Design a protein around this ligand. Structure first.
Ligand code: HEM
Ligand code: HEM
Ligand SMILES: N=C(Nc1cccc(CO[C@@H](CN)COCc2cccc(/N=C(/N)c3cccs3)c2)c1)c1cccs1
Ligand SMILES: N=C(Nc1cccc(CO[C@@H](CN)COCc2cccc(/N=C(/N)c3cccs3)c2)c1)c1cccs1
Ligand SMILES: C[C@H](O)[C@H](O)[C@H]1CNc2nc(N)[nH]c(=O)c2N1
Ligand SMILES: C[C@H](O)[C@H](O)[C@H]1CNc2nc(N)[nH]c(=O)c2N1
Ligand SMILES: [Zn+2]
Lengths: 405, 403
């Protein structure tokens, strides 16, 4: 057979071979002796030039001008700029291409069918924390679009020799406060205790509710971060109700419309964009299963099961499973009523299978992280459960980066 | 450099040092992770595996370095050097079978690993004799519904000849009859073995739940057909605690999960027929066997009976029917007093096993994709647990189909 990984779908009996993994220049955490695929956190001079050349070759292939004179001239341009300055700069169209390719390359993203549809806001002229705030408000307005959500990324200036980084300190643009209590419990979102306490240390007067929207801590090169409160009318939220269980609304639960990740590094051609927040829309299990039911998050499973009058004293009643299903249904029904874009985990995984087929023909494979792609409820009820996946790192890439404090 | 292993729910960390004892490569390389793949793509070698195993055994009985230990190593060496192979003592076999189960990265039920009845069937010389041993295993393991884990070990592979083999993938399998119009009646997973049975002279049924005969093979002989006596195969009719129409679906499952096509490897010796059995985790039946689209595929039928909106994915009709089916399985097994474990209890016990193994051995090989159950993944503690997958020996392994 072919000397490439053989990939099988066990539902359909079909086979493909991944030839794209051959383009991986970056090693993951696995070896012949042990598989570390389940680990969440996995572990320039002429080094820049080779990454830059590779990226420029990718750009010129995507516009089908590979080997051309415009291609050879751009390469020369890039080496001359690196030769004299130690760094280089992307053309506008190269940035747009690179940002889409970073998304298309993200092995943990189930929403990649959408990858070609991304509004890239070029904010590489930004020179203050105040201006970052203006750019971020504009992004939120555009992406929210009164509930008809639109994928977007805003790109701030790249890391530069000596000079400090542009950083957004918050992990997302919208986050609920988590307030550590006297008894050691948490009011609000326990995921956000640290960022909440940083906001207070930097002068934010804290609230005391379960769904208090945090301010943003924004850092321009070589300055302490500055605190910015989002105007409330800019942050679209959806109160949660259930279509048949009338008491569910009385629980006072809610979630924000716009998932906007702000702490990842965008790498393109060896250039590093340390502030490049990106947004799309939610898959309903992110809110209904993880955010609301993780024991270390809002942890509402027992409260909902009690309201549903389930037997919470024994595992074999399946009280957890029944409650989780209703909470996910409430999320879907409430977003739908509110006319805010959301996708259920069946529709999302079906579209991801279509994406895998598109990419098989386009590039000879698709890097995918099975543990992350399979949804956290109803795993084998979705087609992705039955699909083998090959995980590898391609650049352009979204990467984790250390916290700025 | 050893792997740092994190639990994300609790924030706790351990370090796997056991993985350094692995001698067999898995599918992954630094370039690409192949962890989600279901299947894998001389005398001095045997001697080193033999020694390492004999060393494991004597260490387990705390007699590591005794004259009994040195003499046994000499026996193994003398036998390999003269004949190119050797034979296990019954007590070593018992230790090796338990160790293979303990080492199985895909097994969520390993809290039980020390509790395994081992039937030595190495004095078997005919398919006829294999059938008698298999019947006694079933009878013992079933135990009127009070299920007991067991393994029966038939004669090892030998350089000269064909293997002892059980052709069926489990001791209990429902037939799948392929229609002229492509479709399947019964279990679509068993179409191929069904056809093999018919071709070897079995008079087929035409039901959805027809229990298959066994195809048993002695070395270099055609396999022989053996019908299991109906009273040996305990089955559970499926009903629902509150939905009365559910019983009307005529659904049922067998009590005893007994895997019969894996190879047991101990000290470099290979046991090509070594069927093993325990009890079911309820999602195996309620989620996979009954709801996989390529298995009995009953989700739509159940959803319709529940009057659910089948027109749209966002009604979560599939999720709702699946939960009720898993509940019907749990309820019916409990009613019939047949051992079963739900996915919550099983995964909680596996967390305890991880902790026991950390203290005992400094790690535990586990395959996250197989450990996390197929419904309600993140509702179980194993979802939030990082896991390191690697191959230790003694081991259970896949082998080629004998046809
Ligand atoms: C269009 C709608 C989209 C949907 C429904 C979606 C869905 C998801 C989901 C469910 C995850 C896993 C999140 C988690 O478990 O916390 C994810 C991961 C990710 N997605 Fe998306 N996605 C979308 C658009 C985007 C966009 C626009 C980008 C960036 C341009 C993006 C890049 C990512 C990245 C980088 C990750 C991985 C995060 C990590 O490794 O920690 N996706 N996607
Ligand atoms: C005592 C009750 C037991 C329970 C509840 C249990 C549970 C499970 C489950 C749910 C699986 C995954 C099955 C699938 O998805 O098809 C599994 C895999 C496995 N278990 Fe167990 N187990 C038990 C006892 C045993 C015993 C007695 C052995 C052998 C002595 C064993 C060895 C294995 C092996 C080798 C696999 C992997 C099969 C493969 O890789 O294809 N387990 N276990
Ligand atoms: N942040 C760190 N570690 C870390 C700590 C806790 C959790 C994690 C894992 O990150 C995920 C949180 N559990 C991030 O998930 C948020 C997310 C990401 C991507 C898409 C998401 N959902 C969407 N639907 C979209 C967001 C944007 C476009 S689509 C949500 C990582 C590190 C610091 C230094 C090195 S790593
Ligand atoms: N036939 C092959 N292997 C193969 C083919 C298709 C699927 C598979 C995967 O096997 C699993 C079926 N999906 C086996 O699952 C049955 C099983 C295994 C272990 C435990 C099980 N459940 C229990 N509760 C127990 C059974 C025994 C004790 S506990 C069930 C393996 C090969 C082809 C080429 C080389 S090998
Ligand atoms: C240990 C494990 O890797 C971890 O809990 C993963 C599992 N799969 C996931 N899948 C997604 N989409 N998001 C996650 O946060 C996780 N968490
Ligand atoms: C492709 C994927 O690895 C495959 O569907 C696996 C996933 N996890 C599983 N987990 C268990 N316990 N049993 C299985 O058969 C599978 N199948
Ligand atoms: Zn791996």
């Amino acid at each position: 057979g072919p000397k490439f990984p053989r990939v099988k779908n066990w539902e359909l009996g079909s086979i493909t071979y991944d030839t794209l993994c051959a383009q991986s220049q970056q090693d993951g955490p696995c070896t012949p002796r042990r598989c570390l695929g389940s680990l969440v956190l996995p572990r320039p001079a002429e080094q820049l030039l080779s990454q830059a050349r590779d990226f420029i070759n990718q750009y010129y292939s995507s516009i089908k001008r590979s080997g051309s004179q415009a291609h050879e001239e751009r390469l020369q341009e890039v080496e001359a700029e690196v030769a004299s300055t130690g760094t280089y700069h992307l053309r506008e169209s190269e940035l747009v291409f690179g940002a889409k390719q970073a998304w298309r390359n993200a092995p943990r993203c189930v929403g990649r069918i959408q990858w070609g549809k991304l509004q890239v806001f070029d904010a590489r002229d930004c020179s203050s924390a105040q201006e970052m705030f203006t750019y971020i408000c504009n992004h939120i307005k555009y992406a929210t679009n009164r509930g008809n959500l639109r994928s977007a990324i805003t790109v701030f200036p790249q890391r530069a020799p000596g000079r400090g980084d542009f950083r957004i300190w918050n992990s997302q643009l919208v986050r609920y406060a988590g307030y550590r209590q006297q008894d050691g419990s948490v009011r609000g979102d326990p995921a956000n205790v640290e960022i909440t306490e940083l906001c207070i240390q930097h002068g934010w007067t804290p609230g005391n509710g379960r769904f208090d929207v945090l301010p943003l801590l924004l850092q321009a090169p070589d300055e302490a971060p500055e605190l910015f409160v989002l105007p409330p009318e800019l942050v679209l939220e959806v109160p949660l109700e259930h279509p048949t269980l009338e008491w569910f609304a009385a629980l006072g639960l809610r979630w924000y419309a716009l998932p906007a990740v702000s702490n990842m590094l965008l790498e393109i051609g060896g250039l590093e964009f340390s502030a490049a927040p990106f947004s799309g829309w939610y898959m309903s299990t992110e809110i209904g299963t993880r955010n609301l039911c993780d024991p270390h998050r809002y942890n509402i499973l027992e409260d909902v099961a009690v309201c549903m009058d389930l037997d919470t004293r024994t595992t074999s009643s399946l009280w957890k499973d029944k409650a989780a299903v209703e909470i996910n249904l409430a999320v879907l029904h409430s977003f739908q009523l509110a006319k805010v874009t959301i996708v259920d985990h069946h529709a999302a995984t079906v579209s991801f299978m279509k994406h895998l087929d598109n990419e098989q023909k386009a590039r000879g494979g698709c890097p995918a992280d099975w543990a992350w792609i399979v949804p956290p409820i109803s795993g084998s009820l979705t087609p992705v459960f039955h699909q083998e996946m090959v995980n590898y790192i391609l650049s352009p890439a979204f990467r984790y980066q250390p916290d700025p404090w």
